[PDB]
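Exercise 7. Predict the joint structure of the components listed below.
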Amino acid sequence: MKMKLAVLPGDGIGPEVMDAAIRVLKTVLDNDGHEAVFENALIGGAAIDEAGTPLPEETLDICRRSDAILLGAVGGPKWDHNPASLRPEKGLLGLRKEMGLFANLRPVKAYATLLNASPLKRERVENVDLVIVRELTGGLYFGRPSERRGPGENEVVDTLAYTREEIERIIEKAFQLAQIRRKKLASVDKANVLESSRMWREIAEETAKKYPDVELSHMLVDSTAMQLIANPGQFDVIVTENMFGDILSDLASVITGSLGMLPSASLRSDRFGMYEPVHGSAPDIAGQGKANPLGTVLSAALMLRYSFGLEKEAAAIEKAVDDVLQDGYCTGDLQVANGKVVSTIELTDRLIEKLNN
Amino acid sequence: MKMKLAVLPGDGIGPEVMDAAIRVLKTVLDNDGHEAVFENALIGGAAIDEAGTPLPEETLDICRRSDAILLGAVGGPKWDHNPASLRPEKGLLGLRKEMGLFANLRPVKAYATLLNASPLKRERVENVDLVIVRELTGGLYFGRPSERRGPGENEVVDTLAYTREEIERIIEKAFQLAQIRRKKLASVDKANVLESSRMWREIAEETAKKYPDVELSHMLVDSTAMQLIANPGQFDVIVTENMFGDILSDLASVITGSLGMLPSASLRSDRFGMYEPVHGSAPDIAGQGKANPLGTVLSAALMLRYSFGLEKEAAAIEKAVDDVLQDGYCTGDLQVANGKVVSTIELTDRLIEKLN
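Solution:
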């Protein structure tokens, strides 16, 4: 039904791939019966330009005041020189912690017409359908101390600090995910060495009894890296800590070699989320309409599914996104079968075609 | 020349594979004629049994009086039920630190006759030949504090700590190792976040001065990871901290499907080192004489190169190992050509053969 949306196109191709999103986003809404009022805001370099800050003060309002945020991308050679404090990326990492988003979902499903783009043989990547769930707030990244001690500073340390609550929420969000997917979860840690992974494994084990129909399995971080390349089709949902995830995600993001196609979601406790494609802002290409709207489109379908429980539509989008690709219609970047390269806009249209008849 | 080698076969297919190696050596050291005195030593299950600990004090002595260590594997059903402090595996990590080995090398070279094994496409896995250098004394693995604390003990912590030296030495090695290969050295870290990686990115930059013939690059750990899969054919030598090196190594162990034939070498300061096959002890097939001995034999060739400088005695073996797979011979796990499957020993005979 009625929903409110915060649109932050951003830099580079951001605005192009976001238009595709918005148009197709409406095509299915008023087609199913639901309503929705958008409302833009500046983020990244563009905000730096008309507000002096990549994360403008009023943008946060537009966000807090809305249900979900649809993000494009930030970046560009221009501000590539500004002093850290004031740069595109700072602005993005900012609203991320401002919204308190602690879990990042990475859905990696294979497509029949793109497999030839994968580095893996057809039999290992074909029919892959998983989601990497990475922890975002704790870990070795935020843990203090992180200093050089000396004498002479001939010593240094970094810290991996976690709390029962941070571990228990990312892991729980994980079970709920698998719960509604193929109910198969696999907790990834390094429990045979780190005390942090032992607590994690102890926790994931406790939470296990609060979801009886979900098959929990443990796995060491090093072995999961091999299985992701050897037999990734075995996975459903994977939940791991901050660092291990900032890797499993990436790795998992190439075994299909269908990027600029991958969707990304950042959630938290309730249903508020920020969806954005994986690919960057690709500055040296904006204006040309070469932008692949698909990674941002699929991104939108996710918002519908996780943020508003509107599965039909959610799958409608990705189902459409599948047909269009079969016909041979794509925007150059993808290496579709026979092929039939169109434009960002021409493709957005074909998507609205399937979505209507 | 002369060399004393301690032989620690272990349990399982270990003694079987260690024997292939011995023979090959005893054949090769009679390439340019060198005296090799072998001395066996118990380790793991073998030791538990007739000693009482997976690392007899007598075994350590033998290593100490040795110029190198040849090792099979430990691990056995029969000993996987007793206490973690008296299990086969504890003996290894101990022999590990006890010898002060701080650098782990694990070279991966694709075989034109084993490509069907790889989960990768020819175009990507072929032409692969590289080495991962994993630091072994720092990282979260060995960093204090590391325990649960706080109210209700609901907080945990692990410490990633390193000394200026630990980082310096593991980088010298990788630099000299790169020195004698394609002269390339990719240094992997997390400089954009960890303080440790920053000091590392520096320690490395300085040592770069000392070796201007090498071309030193830098890659964040998470990028190296997808590259090892999207384009691993670009790497020669890569060095990285203890934790990143653990994940990255096993990541390079799958891109070829040659598990049964990956060698390894735990090095340190001088030329003393411990060598072994990357694979485990496969107790399941011990005795059936079907174990693949190549992994352990490449390790022996490795010992020759790094521990004595017989850059050719070693190479002879490597080329030998490559010829026999070229004629279609293999032990079973190998997915060769129309290939002729033969026993652990037969295959061994084929190498001794090629070796002249």
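Discussion. The two ends of chain A are 22 Å apart (CA to CA).
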